[PDB]
Amino acid sequence: AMAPADIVKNLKDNMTILEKDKKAEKASEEVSKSLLSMKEILYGTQTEAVAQLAQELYNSGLLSTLVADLQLIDFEGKKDVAQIFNDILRRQIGTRTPTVEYLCTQQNILFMLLKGYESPDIALNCGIMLRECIRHEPLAKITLCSEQFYDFFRYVEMSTFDIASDAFATFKDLLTRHKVLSAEFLEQHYDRFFSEYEKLLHSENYVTKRQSLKLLGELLLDRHNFTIMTKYISKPENLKLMMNLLRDKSRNIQFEAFHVFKVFVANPNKTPPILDILLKNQTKLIEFLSKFQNDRAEDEQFSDEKTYLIKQIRDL
Template sequence: MMQSLENLLGKLSMRKRTPQDIVARLREEIEIAELDTSPEDTKKKAVENASKSISAIRLMLFGDGVAEPVQESIDAFAKMAGEDDLLLLLASHLKIMAFETRKDCVQVFNNLLKRTINDSLTVLDYLSDRDNMELETNLMKGYEATAIALVSGSMLRECLRSEAITKRMLESPLFWKLFALVEASDFDVASDAYATFKEILTRHQAVVASFLEDEYDKFFECYNLLLRSENYVSRRQSLKLLGELLMDRANFKVMTKYIASAENLKLIMNLLLDKGKHIQFEAFHVFKVFVANPNKSQPVLTILTKNKTKLEAYLNNFLTDRQDEQFQEEREAIVEEIKEL
C-alpha cells in the first residue's frame, strides 16, 4: 500500500515538471553517474534518478491509462530530439541503465523518431549529418556490449526506416562491420546484427541497388565469405538473403553480373551438396537463376554442360520428400533446362 502511494506521488511530482526540466535533469544525472570521481553511492543514486527521468518521458509520451498524453509536452520532446541531443542522450548511455530502463529508452527513442516538428519535417530530418552519424556510430558500438546489443540494434533498425540514414550507413565504414557481427560468437548478438544487416539491404531498394552496383566487387567478396562460413546459421541466412537480393527487380544489373560468374556458380553448386537440407533448399533458389538465365556467360555454360549428367541425376532425387508443390515444379523445370543444354 505504501509503495503504491509512493509511486502515485512520484508520478504526480513528475507531471509538474516541464519536458525541458526532465531532460535537463536526465543529462545532469547521467554526467554524475559516468563521472570517475563520483562515489559509488552517488553514482547509484544518479542512475536511479536518471531512470525516473526516462520513465517520466515515457509517461508524458504514452500516458498511463489514466492520464492521456498532452500534445504540448510531446511537441516539446520532439523538438528537443530534433534540435538538441535528446536522441543521442538516450542511445549513448544505455550501459549504465537497468534492464527495465533500457526498455523504456527503446520505447521513447522509437516513438520520438516518428514525430514531426512544426507538422512538417521528422525528427531525423532536423538532425545534421554529423549528429546522425554520431547517433548511428553509438548504436553500432552497442553491439560490442552483449547487455545492450539487442536494445541498440532495435534503435538502429528504427533509424534505418529513414532512406537518408540507410544511404549514409551504406557509404560509411559502419556497414562493413556487420559482416563480422553476423558471425559473432554470441548467438543473440549475431542474430540481432543479421536483422540489422537484412534491414539495410532490403528496405530501401533503389538506394541498395545503387550501392551494390558501385561496390559490387567488395560487397560480394565479403558476402561470399559468409556463404563459405563454417557457421551453419550464417550460411543458411546468407543464402536466403542472397536469393532475395538477386530476385529483387531493383537489383537486376547486380543479379546479371553475379550469375555470369563461374566462381559464383561453383560456390552455389557446392552449397547444393551441403549436408543441411535447409541450406540445400536455399542454394537451389540461387542455382536456378544461373540455369534459367537465357543469356548464360560462356564460363557458366561450360560448367553446366560439363556437369550436365551429374546435375541431372542429382536433381532428380533432390529433396523429393519436401512437401512444397511450387518447389517440386521448379526442380522439375530446372532438370528439363539442364537436359536441353
C-alpha cells in the same frame, strides 16, 4: 518538474553525474524517475507536451547523450531509452519527420548505435533503435554508405549467437527495405561486398550460413538488382559454389542454395565458362534434381521449378 523541459534537464544533469562512488545511485534513481515520466508524457494515464518533449530532446542533445552513455543506465532503463527514442523517431508534422531531419545533422548517434554491437550489455538495445532509424531512407543511406557498414560482416560472425543474429536482422534490412538505395550500393560496391559475402557462405555459425544463402537468392530475385544478378551469375566460381552447396549435408542448406542455383540456369545469355560447367555436369544434374527433395513437394512452385530446371539443362 512536471513539464517536458524540466524532465529533460533533470535527465541531462544526472546522466552527466554518471559520466564521472555512492552518489551514483541517487543519480540512477533520478535517471529512472525522469525516464518514467518521459514515457508518461508520450502516453498519459496531451499532444503539445509530446511536441515539447520532442523539441527539448533535440535541443538538449539528450538523444545523443543517452546513446553515448547507454551503458551507464540500468536494464529496465536502457529499454525505456529504446522505447522513447523509437516513439520520437516516428513523430510527424505533416509530411515531415523532424527526428529524421534532426538525425541527419546529428549522425554520430547512428554511428554510436552501429558501434554498440561490440558492447554486449547494450548491443541488443542499439540494434533495436538502429533498425528503427534505418526504416527511414536518409538514415539508411548514411548507415549503408558508411565505411563502418562492413563491420556488419564481423558482427554476424560473432560467437554470441543472439547478438550476431540481431546484427543480421539489421544487415538484412539495410540491403532490402530501400530497394533503389540498396541497388545503387551493390552495383557501385560489388567486388568488395561480394568478396565479403562469400565469406559468410562458409560460416562456422550455421544460422549465418543458411540465412546468408537465403538472402543471396532473394537479392538475385529482386528487379532493382538486375545488373547485380547478371554480374553474379556470370562468375564460374559462384556457380561452382552453389552446385557444391546443393550436395551439402544439411537439407536446409541444399534448399536455400537451390534458389540461388535456379537463377544461374534460367539465364539465357550464359558465358562459356558457365555453359561448360553445366554441360560437363548435365547428366549428373538431370539425375540429381529428379531425386531432390521430392518428399518436400507441396511447395508446388518448387516442384514446378525442378521440372523447369531439368528441362533447361536438357535443352542447353
